[PDB]
Structure 1
């Protein structure tokens, strides 16, 4: 499964069941459901705090232990915080920080020109500075994963979360194939591929590396500047496979300056070895994110 942390061949904190108090469901997938909950005695000078709890729907017990081990390793400002597990009785639970604004795709769409309707964001569409801040934070999380030699394989805005103060982090609760089924191409009986985010070598040769994740980051950058639109939305799944393998590139979004579109094309070099590194991509976006109003006003 592309995006499943256990596809990486690289101690776990435990929380008592009495310390977790379920509030309501946030979502559900084929592997289980997610709830908002209050977690007691988790962090000092807080006493009580909101968390997102993933409940497991055997080999699944072994998958759970391996997932928990890998999630414990990931500790970064731009990776969704994993607090630990609850193993006393059933269902087994995984506890994560709660991200108020939900997934990045939903956040972009709700703050784009097609939205229906102010604590963390100004009225109307997200400005250039805000779009650059979002992009920079996702790149920072990808720099951290590249540094640990982790290959995501399902990087996309749906697989990022947005918290209070527009803090953006990479992470998901394993429900993207259920919530965003049209973002995947169904092969056989259960295989679902995020082809629109995949480079030619991943589609043609099934090779996944730090470089295929750079390509996916370029597509993320494109989703950010189109306010969450699906890449190749005008194409069917087979038509998108044809365009990607033929070497066609996503058009410059209207809200995207040429400086940013350059960073996107740098992620989309046909040859994996010639794609810019995530360190270089993050350095450029961060520089543009923290540029003074005088400098990015002439970019916009």
Structure 2
């Protein structure tokens, strides 16, 4: 079905009473519904009242909602956005997620870019552009989520920074509320009717043959690594959608970002081997990123 829609995977759901959810205000909006900030009571022992993100269904839908809830409940990992469960008592149908204070990683990258000064600094992040060690910590975390999805044989098909969230202490997790085509329409190619393909993130076998695997996700992860080291720039931004299809199917690679050490660009190139079976595993890409994120400053300073 839709690239990046969890029910594209063919592999218990917690219920929350409507009275325990108090909507505060809207956070975002798309064709399939809205996301609110809400207070959720009686959800976690430590917290009598905590903030959550609530996704309200705009309403087939109820059967898609049921299979989404099943698959979200099955995902339990430090770098997948936490799903608390559903409110099916009347309407609208609600899904309850942890609140990720910094929003999506593309927005977070662009607001800590090469132009950032003292004012960009805050609780969680230093002033000025994100440093090598912070960029590596972001990439490591997204890779760890992708290790977990690969271990469960899930394929994402729309992995991009816009589809990752950033929380307190710069925790980064894979997740979205199904509105990236509404909020970031320029990141998709419209192919008639309603279909919208994230071509700039897709390998040749996906664009040419419509094949999607663990190995096409690793390609997409390579593109995520490029977005991180460009502070959120669009891949192929100088190109039209058809120009980008021509570049990707002809074997052109994204150029080393200014902020990317050769060792890291080598990790991006391992994700971009033309032949899927020749790309490095997500386990290996994650081991190499984690090692660099955790490396002492004396080592990172000469990278």
TM-score (norm 2): 0.98
CA contact (8 A) 1:158 1:176 kept: yes
1:158 aligns with 2:162: yes
Listed one character per residue, the Cα deviations across residues 175-227 of structure 1 (whole Å, up to 9, x for unaligned) are: 00000000000001100000000000000000000000000000000000000
Q: Aligned partners of 1:173, 1:58: CA distance in 2, in Å?
A: 16
* 1:45 CA displacement: 1.6
- 1:27-46 deviation per Cα after TM superposition (whole angstroms, max 9, x unaligned): 00000000000000000021
Over 3 Å off, 4+ runs: none
| Equivalent pair of 1:109/1:115 in contact (CA under 8 Å) | no
8 A Cα contact 1:12 1:84, kept in partner: yes
Q: Is the 8 A contact 2:37 2:99 kept in 1?
A: yes
Counterpart Cα distance in 2 of 1:96 and 1:34: 10
Cα distance, 1:58 vs. partner? Answer: 7.9
TM-score (structure 1 length as normaliser) = 0.99
The separation in 1 between residues aligned to 2:171 and 2:7, in whole angstroms, is 26
Residue 56 to residue 254, structure 1, CA distance change in 2 (3 Å): same
Contact 2:115 2:129 (C-alpha < 8 Å) held by counterparts: no
Across the two proteins, how many residue pairs are aligned to each other? Answer: 298
Deviation at residue 108 of structure 1 after TM alignment: 0.1
Contact 1:13 1:85 in 2 (8 A): yes
Cα deviation, residue 115, structure 1 = 4.9
**Would you say the 8 A contact 2:216–2:276 is kept in 1?**
yes
C-alpha distance in structure 2 between counterparts of 1:251 and 1:260, whole Å: 12
Separation in structure 2 between the aligned mates of residue 45 and residue 255 of structure 1, nearest angstrom = 41
The offset of 1:114, in angstroms, is: 4.0
Residue ranges of structure 2 left out of the alignment (5+ in a row) = none
Q: 1:103 to 1:58 in 2, by over 3 A?
A: closer
